[PDB]
Design an enzyme around this catalytic site. Structure first.
Site, PDB file in Angstrom:
ATOM      1  N   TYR A 190       0.892  -1.335   0.010  1.00 17.07           N
ATOM      2  CA  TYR A 190      -0.120   0.073   0.083  1.00 17.07           C
ATOM      3  C   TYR A 190       0.906   1.263   0.064  1.00 17.07           C
ATOM      4  O   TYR A 190       0.696   2.116  -0.962  1.00 17.07           O
ATOM      5  CB  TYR A 190      -0.996  -0.043   1.364  1.00 17.07           C
ATOM      6  N   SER A 193       2.606   1.838  -3.560  1.00 17.37           N
ATOM      7  CA  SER A 193       1.274   2.097  -4.165  1.00 17.37           C
ATOM      8  C   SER A 193       1.300   3.754  -4.370  1.00 17.37           C
ATOM      9  O   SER A 193       0.971   4.369  -5.280  1.00 17.37           O
ATOM     10  CB  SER A 193       0.353   1.321  -4.290  1.00 17.37           C
TER      11      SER A 193
HETATM   12  N1  LIG Z   1      -9.654   6.360   5.435  1.00 22.46           N
HETATM   13  C1  LIG Z   1      -8.419   6.465   5.976  1.00 22.46           C
HETATM   14  O1  LIG Z   1      -7.908   6.070   7.122  1.00 22.46           O
HETATM   15  C2  LIG Z   1      -7.684   7.035   4.687  1.00 22.46           C
HETATM   16  C3  LIG Z   1      -6.397   7.797   5.239  1.00 22.46           C
HETATM   17  C4  LIG Z   1      -5.455   8.060   4.014  1.00 22.46           C
HETATM   18  C5  LIG Z   1      -5.901   7.875   2.754  1.00 22.46           C
HETATM   19  N2  LIG Z   1      -6.935   6.998   2.326  1.00 22.46           N
HETATM   20  C6  LIG Z   1      -7.384   7.109   1.057  1.00 22.46           C
HETATM   21  O2  LIG Z   1      -8.533   7.684   0.726  1.00 22.46           O
HETATM   22  C7  LIG Z   1      -9.255   7.282  -0.478  1.00 22.46           C
HETATM   23  C8  LIG Z   1     -10.663   6.669  -0.022  1.00 22.46           C
HETATM   24  O3  LIG Z   1     -10.354   5.855   1.113  1.00 22.46           O
HETATM   25  P1  LIG Z   1     -11.659   5.253   1.842  1.00 22.46           P
HETATM   26  O4  LIG Z   1     -11.127   4.801   3.241  1.00 22.46           O
HETATM   27  O5  LIG Z   1     -12.739   5.929   1.888  1.00 22.46           O
HETATM   28  O6  LIG Z   1     -11.822   3.826   0.947  1.00 22.46           O
HETATM   29  P2  LIG Z   1     -12.782   2.665   0.871  1.00 22.46           P
HETATM   30  O7  LIG Z   1     -13.804   2.889   2.167  1.00 22.46           O
HETATM   31  O8  LIG Z   1     -12.007   1.517   1.263  1.00 22.46           O
HETATM   32  O9  LIG Z   1     -13.687   2.792  -0.445  1.00 22.46           O
HETATM   33  C9  LIG Z   1     -12.710   2.616  -1.500  1.00 22.46           C
HETATM   34  C10 LIG Z   1     -13.535   2.865  -2.633  1.00 22.46           C
HETATM   35  O10 LIG Z   1     -12.905   2.803  -3.999  1.00 22.46           O
HETATM   36  C11 LIG Z   1     -13.598   1.763  -4.657  1.00 22.46           C
HETATM   37  N3  LIG Z   1     -12.809   0.844  -5.717  1.00 22.46           N
HETATM   38  C12 LIG Z   1     -11.761  -0.061  -5.102  1.00 22.46           C
HETATM   39  N4  LIG Z   1     -11.243  -0.408  -6.048  1.00 22.46           N
HETATM   40  C13 LIG Z   1     -12.068  -0.142  -7.486  1.00 22.46           C
HETATM   41  C14 LIG Z   1     -11.803  -0.336  -8.719  1.00 22.46           C
HETATM   42  N5  LIG Z   1     -10.956  -1.021  -9.306  1.00 22.46           N
HETATM   43  N6  LIG Z   1     -12.341   0.643  -9.678  1.00 22.46           N
HETATM   44  C15 LIG Z   1     -13.631   1.667  -9.134  1.00 22.46           C
HETATM   45  N7  LIG Z   1     -13.747   1.722  -7.714  1.00 22.46           N
HETATM   46  C16 LIG Z   1     -12.702   0.803  -6.984  1.00 22.46           C
HETATM   47  C17 LIG Z   1     -14.395   1.082  -3.741  1.00 22.46           C
HETATM   48  O11 LIG Z   1     -15.349   0.163  -4.397  1.00 22.46           O
HETATM   49  P3  LIG Z   1     -16.294  -0.999  -3.817  1.00 22.46           P
HETATM   50  O12 LIG Z   1     -17.504  -0.528  -2.789  1.00 22.46           O
HETATM   51  O13 LIG Z   1     -17.004  -1.718  -4.885  1.00 22.46           O
HETATM   52  O14 LIG Z   1     -15.372  -1.736  -3.012  1.00 22.46           O
HETATM   53  C18 LIG Z   1     -15.001   1.948  -2.735  1.00 22.46           C
HETATM   54  O15 LIG Z   1     -15.949   2.912  -3.303  1.00 22.46           O
HETATM   55  C19 LIG Z   1      -8.228   6.085  -0.996  1.00 22.46           C
HETATM   56  O16 LIG Z   1      -7.526   6.514  -2.133  1.00 22.46           O
HETATM   57  C20 LIG Z   1      -7.545   5.641   0.325  1.00 22.46           C
HETATM   58  O17 LIG Z   1      -6.250   4.908  -0.029  1.00 22.46           O
HETATM   59  C21 LIG Z   1      -7.714   6.799   3.264  1.00 22.46           C
END
Ligand SMILES: NC(=O)c1ccc[n+]([C@@H]2O[C@H](COP(=O)([O-])OP(=O)(O)OC[C@H]3O[C@@H](n4cnc5c(N)ncnc54)[C@H](OP(=O)(O)O)[C@@H]3O)[C@@H](O)[C@H]2O)c1
EC number: 1.1.1.184
Length: 273
Positions: A190, A193
């Site tokens: 991760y 990436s």
């Molecule tokens: N939350 C945190 O603690 C945190 C901290 C730092 C950075 N981030 C970053 O912020 C962003 C959002 O995070 P989150 O925690 O909200 O993520 P999340 O809840 O795990 O949701 C990820 C979203 O991305 C979608 N996704 C995954 N693979 C995909 C694909 N091949 N094509 C289209 N959609 C796809 C998922 O779809 P499905 O529902 O179908 O799985 C979902 O809608 C990410 O880039 C993450 O790396 C998060």
């Protein structure tokens, strides 16, 4: 006429970004998702709030899907004003898989798909458009956990898209061959990436400045910040909505802005590494 779009926008931070763009962006908002049932349910949720997003399917791992979205945007709007590359994966130990597969599938979406999104859609970005690539502050920790040789390679202003692609590819191969530690890599696919997403953002900014500087397009990488865990293990809802703040800021930078460009941004501040 104007249009903003969010990837992985059916839940989490992407949903919060789609909501805020519906409130703050002068134009249409396209919420996209790979699972159409999930995407349309999210659209209905925002509709129940009184908002008006549009839906389009998008799986960033599927090039035909990216290109169908591209074609839709050219036809309906003549291009794109705002692109938020939010979609990502991170595999925990409840999804048991060998390390080389974890590495391959994490870079497949987070890096290679995000890159394919940028290459297919940057040509249709309108003047004064903005691109926001959601990264993570983990990318810094990953950088620090690279050997000095790798750090110098990622850090260099002269690194090309091709050089970067090859390095990301090298991480995956090195994990297949069980030599990633010897080769100076960290242990987090991760983090690697996201480092790729961060560095790709710098590269795309140099490319825009090279080929089309007068279009004034801004591309930045974004850390939505540490989110906090609730008692049930989930990301607390407030912090998830708070997570949209920096992405939305970067999406809506006024037309005259010339900075942040190609930067990594957290809590509206440039991260220097
Ligand atoms: N939350 C945190 O603690 C945190 C901290 C730092 C950075 N981030 C970053 O912020 C962003 C959002 O995070 P989150 O925690 O909200 O993520 P999340 O809840 O795990 O949701 C990820 C979203 O991305 C979608 N996704 C995954 N693979 C995909 C694909 N091949 N094509 C289209 N959609 C796809 C998922 O779809 P499905 O529902 O179908 O799985 C979902 O809608 C990410 O880039 C993450 O790396 C998060």
């Amino acid at each position: 006429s104007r249009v903003a779009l969010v990837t992985g926008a059916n839940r989490g931070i992407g949903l919060a970004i789609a909501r805020e763009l519906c409130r703050q962006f002068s134009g249409d908002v396209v919420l996209t998702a790979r699972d159409v049932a999930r995407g349309q349910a999210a659209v209905q949720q925002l509709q129940a709030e009184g908002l008006s997003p549009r839906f389009h399917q998008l799986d960033i791992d599927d090039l035909q899907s990216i290109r169908a979205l591209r074609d839709f945007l050219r036809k309906e709007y003549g291009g794109l004003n705002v692109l938020v590359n939010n979609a990502a994966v991170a595999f925990k130990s409840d999804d048991p898989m060998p390390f080389d597969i974890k590495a391959e599938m994490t870079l497949k979406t987070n890096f290679f798909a995000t890159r394919n999104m940028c290459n297919e859609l940057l040509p249709i970005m309108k003047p004064h458009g903005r691109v926001v690539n959601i990264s993570s502050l983990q990318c810094l920790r990953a950088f620090e956990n690279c050997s000095e040789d790798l750090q110098e390679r990622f850090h260099s202003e002269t690194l090309t898209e091709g050089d970067l692609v090859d390095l990301m590819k090298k991480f995956v191969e090195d994990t297949k061959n069980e030599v990633h530690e010897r080769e100076g890599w960290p242990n987090s696919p991760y983090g690697v990436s996201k480092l790729g997403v961060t560095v790709l953002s710098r590269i795309l900014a140099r490319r825009l400045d090279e080929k089309r500087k007068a279009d004034r397009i801004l591309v930045n990488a974004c850390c939505p910040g540490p989110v906090k865990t609730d008692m049930d293990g989930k990301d607390s809802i407030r912090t998830v909505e708070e997570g949209a703040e920096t992405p939305v800021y970067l999406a809506l930078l006024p037309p005259d802005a010339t900075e942040p460009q190609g930067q990594l941004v957290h809590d509206k501040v440039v991260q220097n590494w």
